[PDB]
């Protein structure tokens, strides 16, 4: 058991942002029907179908899971923030039974 | 020469076809007596996904 990493596998650039459907062989051609659009958003995160390599599927998964945490943490920080600036927490804390909570002023 | 020229556009007249009253490039023509020699290629796909089909002499006519 030991640490094993591969350095600089992928270059970072917006080249593939302009070319949607790069992950799949069928979609990289381009659209001639509107069905190409639905297939794009659907087969986006099916890493097992993109490539046979189990290594690349593992790299993609371990890094996408880092995204859901960041997505969660701004959501969680939003509740703390929205509870700080647009709420009645200090008032509810002194009379909890009669006062009701409110974190979404319109 | 038996049929239309290579690279020439022609209009289809099969009522069954997805490409009816539509235009396509002539890819090739066979001069061996085949019933449907004229090979035509279109940009737009059909419902299956095929963009070529062999048509006949009578079934094709000049463009527009």
């Amino acid at each position: 058991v030991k640490i094993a990493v591969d350095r600089n596998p992928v270059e970072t650039n917006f080249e593939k942002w302009a070319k949607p459907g790069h992950f799949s062989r069928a979609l990289a051609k381009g659209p001639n029907t509107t069905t190409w659009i639905w297939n794009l958003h659907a087969d986006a995160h099916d890493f097992d179908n993109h490539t046979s390599d189990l290594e690349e599927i593992s790299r993609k998964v371990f890094s996408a899971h880092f995204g859901q945490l960041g997505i969660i943490l701004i959501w969680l920080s939003g509740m703390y923030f929205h509870g700080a600036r647009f709420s009645n927490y200090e008032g509810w804390l002194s009379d909890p039974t009669h006062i009701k909570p409110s974190a979404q002023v319109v | 020469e038996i049929g239309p020229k290579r690279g020439s556009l022609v209009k289809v007249l099969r009522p069954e076809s997805y490409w009816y009253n539509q235009v396509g490039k002539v890819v090739s023509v066979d001069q061996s007596g085949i019933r449907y020699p004229v090979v035509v290629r279109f940009e737009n796909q059909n419902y299956a996904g095929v963009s070529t089909n062999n048509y006949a002499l009578d079934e094709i006519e000049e463009v527009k």
Binding site: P20, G30, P31, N32 | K11, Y20, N21
Partner: protein
């Protein structure tokens, strides 16, 4: 007046509905203090409500027995009895905007199809071209009748049929 409808100024139920909707806010305003922000919010809503009712009366609207304003659609009665802004004039306002969307999208479609790979131009737009057409469509009616009288609007039996 017309159709047995009273104007909204002379109606009693119209003013009854005003006194009701203000009474709800006055009761709601009693809870909070004078200088607080909830007080300022409700006073503004009170100010808007008082403005909504007087403006609809000033505009010669027609209120029924229920006390709510009614609209008239025939341009003859609208023009005769001075009710044109309700429906008859909103129709021309929308058609100019609707035609603008059509004349713009029709031109982007035709021009991209004159080049190679028009499929890519739909999913990946040419924004400089789209803005150019979007600011050139102010006089869309002129171009339509220009294109109709010319004959380059419609296609002529070069379309697919089914039988």
């Amino acid at each position: 007046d017309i159709a047995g409808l009273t104007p909204c100024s002379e109606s009693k139920a119209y003013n009854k509905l005003e006194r009701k909707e203000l009474k709800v806010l006055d009761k709601r305003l009693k809870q909070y203090e004078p200088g607080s922000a909830p007080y300022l919010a409700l006073q503004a809503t009170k100010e808007r409500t008082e403005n909504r009712f007087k403006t609809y009366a000033k505009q010669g609207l027609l209120c029924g027995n229920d006390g709510l304003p009614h609209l008239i659609s025939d341009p003859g009665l609208a023009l005769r009895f001075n009710h044109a802004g309700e429906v008859f004039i909103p129709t021309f306002g929308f058609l100019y905007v609707a035609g603008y969307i059509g004349h713009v999208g029709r031109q982007y479609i035709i021009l991209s199809k004159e080049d190679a790979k028009p499929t890519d131009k739909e999913i990946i737009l040419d924004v400089p071209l789209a803005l150019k057409l979007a600011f050139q469509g102010w006089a869309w009616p002129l171009a339509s009748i220009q294109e109709l009288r010319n004959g380059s609007l419609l296609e002529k039996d070069e379309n697919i049929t089914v039988s």
